[PDB]
Amino acid sequence: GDAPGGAHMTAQTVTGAVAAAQLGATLPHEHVIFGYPGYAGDVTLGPFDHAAALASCTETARALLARGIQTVVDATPNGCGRNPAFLREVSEATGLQILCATGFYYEGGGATTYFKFRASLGDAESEIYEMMRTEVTEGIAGTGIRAGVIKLASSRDAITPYEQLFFRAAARVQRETGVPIITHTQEGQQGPQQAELLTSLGADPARIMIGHMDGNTDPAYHRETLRHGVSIAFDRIGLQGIVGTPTDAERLSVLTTLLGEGYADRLLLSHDSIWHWLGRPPAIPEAALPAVKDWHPLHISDDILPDLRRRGITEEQVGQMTVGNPARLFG
């Protein structure tokens, strides 16, 4: 099929290099810990309880392994609580393999002030390129822990000029190292534009996963994106009818259509769940309880897969999505 072509390094997890064959079933987009930009400024009342986060996270890790999930890809942006050392902790404690990311979030929800300022003063793209390259090849913050993927994100109405700085830096790092790229699309838009842009810049589509594609329910939009040869992920499975999100029933309808059209090799599945929130614990209005009810990392293993199988999807298609595709994209 379409194999990764160009520079290449074996999958880097927070605990070191891992062979593609050892990745096993994988959730390509989750967040062990996560905090929206600003969470740190609420440190007095919402401090990080490391002991509790570690207990809870490892328990979630252990439950994933119970389900045969050997690997999780943590997509947390550098300014949203990324903590490679903590992920290494969670990994060494449970045996769950974790890959972390390098990247900043979309303009609308990221810690954008910094690079927007540096971009006004000089060559920010080049500076973003050096950070990503260093994090992928040498390590994050002096820990030696390397990023196994680059995380890119765009806004709803366009991939903004600020966002494009990151897309150009990542493309260059991609070309030079072969590292995988995973993305965020805001509210079901810009999937095709991200794929076009990344490929146009020389990024290997065999190493690109356009995310939150489940955010759009017109399969035409998905096919237009797949036309580029990149993989696409229904990665907010379980987050229903909230923040623009469709219902899982809607996602499944699109998914089985795409599956029935032969796209298994290019479909990945995830929850975009957060195991432990940073800042003060989120206050969940009762009315939103159903929207987040299945939004946890065991939902696909326990509800989705069995539901695709009973719908006609095959053990082979499911293994392609959950093991085949990840092995090739990140391995």
Residues that bind Co ion (CB under 5 A): 75, 184, 272
Binding partner of 184, given a copy of itself, Co ion, none, CB within 5-8 angstroms per partner class: Co ion
The residue from 54, 65, 111, 158 that contacts a copy of itself (CB under 8 A) is 111
22: its two tokens = 């050892």
Cβ-Cβ contacts under 8 Å for 233 (sequence gap 6 or more): 28, 29, 182, 209, 210, 211, 212, 213, 214, 267, 268, 269, 270
Q: Which stretch binds a copy of itself (CB under 8 A): 35-43, 149-157, 207-215, 320-328?
A: 35-43
Residue 238 host element (H or E)? none
Distances (CA, A) of 103 to 45, 153, 185: 28, 8, 14
Cβ-Cβ contacts under 8 Å for 282 (sequence gap 6 or more): none
Displacement of CA 206 from its chain's centroid (Å): 16
Q: How many residues bind a copy of itself (CB under 8 A)?
A: 44
Binding partner of 45, given a copy of itself, Co ion, none, CB within 5-8 angstroms per partner class: a copy of itself
The residue from 25, 131, 153, 313 that contacts a copy of itself (CB under 8 A) is 131
Binding partner of 109, given a copy of itself, Co ion, none, CB within 5-8 angstroms per partner class: a copy of itself
* Three-state helix/strand/coil letters over 132-178: HHHHHHCCCCCCCCCCCEEEEECCCCCCCHHHHHHHHHHHHHHHHHC
Contacts of a copy of itself in 73-102 (CB under 8 A): 77-79, 82
Residue 102 host element (H or E)? strand 101-102
130 binds a copy of itself (CB under 8 A): yes
Rounded (to 5) percent helix, strand, coil in the chain: 45, 15, 40
Contacts of a copy of itself in 250-289 (CB under 8 A): 279-280, 282-285, 288
121 binds a copy of itself (CB under 8 A): yes
Minimum distance of a copy of itself from residue 316's CB (angstroms): 40
Residues annotated within a binding site for Zn(2+): 29, 31, 151, 184, 212, 272
Q: Which residues bind a copy of itself (CB under 8 A)?
A: 35-45, 47, 77-79, 82, 104, 109-115, 117-118, 121-122, 127, 130-131, 134-135, 139-142, 279-280, 282-285, 288
